[PDB]
């Protein structure tokens, strides 16, 4: 029982792995290849950094 349980624990850690995988290919999916998108995300970003400082 506890053996297979432990197998499930390791499995869950792998689950975290896949969580980082998922989030990762989500952040890489942000780059469509479309330049207008890049400009939008850019201006947005600038607004963000500017919003943080003063």
């Amino acid at each position: 029982a506890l053996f297979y349980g432990d197998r499930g624990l390791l499995s869950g850690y792998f689950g975290l792995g896949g969580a980082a995988r998922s989030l990762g290919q989500g952040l890489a999916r942000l780059q469509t290849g479309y330049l207008r998108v890049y400009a939008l995300l850019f201006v947005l970003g600038a607004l963000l950094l500017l919003g943080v400082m003063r």
């Binding site: 980082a20 995988r21 989030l23 990762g24 290919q25 952040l27 890489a28 999916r29 942000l30 780059q31 290849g33 330049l35 890049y38 400009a39 995300l41 850019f42 947005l44 970003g45 600038a46 963000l48 950094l49 500017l50 943080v52 400082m53 003063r54």
Partner: protein, 427 residues
Amino acid sequence: MTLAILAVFSVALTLLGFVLPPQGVKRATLLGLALALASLLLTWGKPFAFGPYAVDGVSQVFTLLALLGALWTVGLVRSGRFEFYLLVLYAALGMHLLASTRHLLLMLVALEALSLPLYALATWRRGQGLEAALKYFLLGALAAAFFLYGAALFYGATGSLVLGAPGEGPLYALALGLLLVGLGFKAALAPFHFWTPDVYQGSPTPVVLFMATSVKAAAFAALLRVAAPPEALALLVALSVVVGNLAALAQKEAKRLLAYSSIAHAGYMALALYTGNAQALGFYLLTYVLATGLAFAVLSQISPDRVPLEALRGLYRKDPLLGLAFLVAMLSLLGLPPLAGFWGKYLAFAEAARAGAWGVLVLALVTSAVSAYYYLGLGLAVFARPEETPFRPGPPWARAAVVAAGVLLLALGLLPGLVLPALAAGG
């Protein structure tokens, strides 16, 4: 003067290349870059201040590295169009200027000086290369606009266009942010990093080597000159680190994964900015330019237009020393002891913690541990069974290049007390 060598060689070679064979012009640009570099080594600890131009420790180290990138990138590009060396000289001088002033407007001029010929170097005329050039150029010009408006707001909040001017309240801050936009874009910090993957994947590989090393170097040199505030610094860091490594996980192509890797690495480097130590940053970028330069030379020996990760596999059997040097590069980029990369990362982290930026620091460390996924997925992949993969096993030039520069890495991993004593003022 280094600037003298660069100017002379550039202007001369422009018209001399009409009377010279392309190869002879390569010999030329090589010699000139080398001479600039040598002039640098001979004046180590000179500080030579002219007008807005100023050669101190920062200019010395960062233009040393940038010139090293120019040297290596020129080495690999036998392809005969004398401009495809000339422009590298142009860019090189420009990067030097960029690292050599606190003058905002001369800085802008230097930014255009280095980034204008690069838009051109993104052309192996590949349809994807053209896309890269276009993206790089548009996003670049917009960033330029922001940096210029930042300079005008800096001159707004203070009577000067020189960095080091005392600095007001709100308008000063707004100015620094508007500068950090353009400068950050140029160093591939989030959220100003979008261009990097497309451009690295799209551009011809040796050109990409030139970019990911020299450009980043000069960019950070110029970032040391800015009074970068803790808050903005934190933002840039956290975003660049996270997006860097995490997006890097999803990459199935080599160059693009290395671009994302460079975004995360810019993230780590920015930590040094917390104190603006510059001794740390210098070291870090020494290790980085070495290992990245190596990696991209190796990635050049496979394919210039694009490289899938499978191509890396079996590299050891093919060339043992390129396999080993590539692994070493991957480990030094991981920041794993006893390699120089570990010392660079440590030296930046050190300034982060010294500055008391703990949450940011820890975050960086966690996702840095994450980064061990993909750095190993290459270095180890060296030993896998070879897929049918393109390989031009290089000249003595490149083999001894990758090998020597590689040896340097663990050489400084064991003995950072060699180069670190004076990456400072030069004593």
